[PDB]
Amino acid sequence: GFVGIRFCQECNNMLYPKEDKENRILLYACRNCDYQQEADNSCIYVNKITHEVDELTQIIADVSQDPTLPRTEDHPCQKCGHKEAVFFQSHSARAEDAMRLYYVCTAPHCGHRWTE
Amino acid sequence: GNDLYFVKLPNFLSVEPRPFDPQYYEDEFEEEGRTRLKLKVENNARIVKWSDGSMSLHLGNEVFDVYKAPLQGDHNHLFIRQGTGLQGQAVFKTKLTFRPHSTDSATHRKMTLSLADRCSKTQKI
Amino acid sequence: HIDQLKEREYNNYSWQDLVASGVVEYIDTLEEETVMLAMTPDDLQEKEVAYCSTYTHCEI
Numbered sequence: 001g002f003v004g005i006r007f008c009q010e011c012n013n014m015l016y017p018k019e020d021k022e023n024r025i026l027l028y029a030c031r032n033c034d035y036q037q038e039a040d041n042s043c044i045y046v047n048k049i050t051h052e053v054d055e056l057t058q059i060i061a062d063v064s065q066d067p068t069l070p071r072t073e074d075h076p077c078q079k080c081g082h083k084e085a086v087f088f089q090s091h092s093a094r095a096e097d098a099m100r101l102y103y104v105c106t107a108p109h110c111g112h113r114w115t116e
Numbered sequence: 117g118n119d120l121y122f123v124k125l126p127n128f129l130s131v132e133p134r135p136f137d138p139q140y141y142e143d144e145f146e147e148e149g150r151t152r153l154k155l156k157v158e159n160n161a162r163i164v165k166w167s168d169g170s171m172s173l174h175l176g177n178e179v180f181d182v183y184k185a186p187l188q189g190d191h192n193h194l195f196i197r198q199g200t201g202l203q204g205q206a207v208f209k210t211k212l213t214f215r216p217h218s219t220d221s222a223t224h225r226k227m228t229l230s231l232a233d234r235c236s237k238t239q240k241i
Numbered sequence: 242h243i244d245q246l247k248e249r250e251y252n253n254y255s256w257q258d259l260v261a262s263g264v265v266e267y268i269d270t271l272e273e274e275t276v277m278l279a280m281t282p283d284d285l286q287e288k289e290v291a292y293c294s295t296y297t298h299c300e301i
């Protein structure tokens with residue numbers, strides 16, 4: 001998971017995490033404001049050392065209209081069932097050790113992407 | 117009676133929309149002035165067709181040389197919209213799937229004046 | 242276009258008519274990044290097992 005930025009309600013500033021001494025709870029106070037709002041996550045800061053990223057979250061569907069990008073007819077979609085798909089490698093910095101391919105369905109109003 | 121008879125021309129070849137009539141024509145206009153007068157002493161028309169499939173448009177002994185190139189951004193219908201009927205009575209004709217590509221040209225001139233002047237004056241005494 | 246361009250000088254046609262007719266196009270190095278470019282008209286635009294089948298331009 002993560003933690004987000006939760007913004008103040010008075011000043012629209014960034015809320016810090018703060019432990020309530022003498023109810024024993026986790027709060028969110030402001031700097032600029034005197035705004036105390038009550039936490040729910042019980043989680044403050046997270047850090048993925050493995051930096052485990054799923055690439056299918058970064059892939060946009062717009063790739064399919066790329067003239068310069070190879071086209072197959074051997075992998076069909078799963079939502080719609082189209083036959084055409086484009087494919088490319090991670091195309092990312094920080095690629096750990098992978099030459100894994102990624103597919104996008106080449107049919108408008110679908111933009112389904114998958115990895116095999 | 118119906119065929120490709122639409123003809124675009126440049127600004128300097130703007131032909132009058134109406135026949136020449138002595139009751140519609142007047143003297144208003146004059147290297148500088150040379151290009152000025154040409155607008156109405158030339159610009160009724162005879163698009164001559166040639167054995168190679170080219171066309172030449174004549175408004176004098178001067179010639180505009182023309183090719184019947186295709187068009188795809190301007191796919192209209194051409195029509196004689198005369199004010200008579202309800203709000204311009206457009207009579208049907210040819211469709212704008214082609215229009216002329218053709219050559220009509222101009223020129224420039226030259227100048228010359230002076231560089232600097234004299235100097236080194238001296239007051240009396 | 243080859244017929245009009247072969248008969249140039251004997252008629253007023255020229256390179257700029259290929260530009261104006263939308264036949265040839267100036268492509269910048271920075272736009273050449275995005276073309277899917279053929280290297281001969283025929284040989285790259287025939288029918289085989291597919292290389293791209295999405296060519297956008299050809300070399301002159």
Ligand SMILES: [Zn+2]
Nearest residue numbers: 008013030033
């Ligand atoms: Zn605040």
Ligand SMILES: [Zn+2]
Nearest residue numbers: 077080105110
């Ligand atoms: Zn699909």
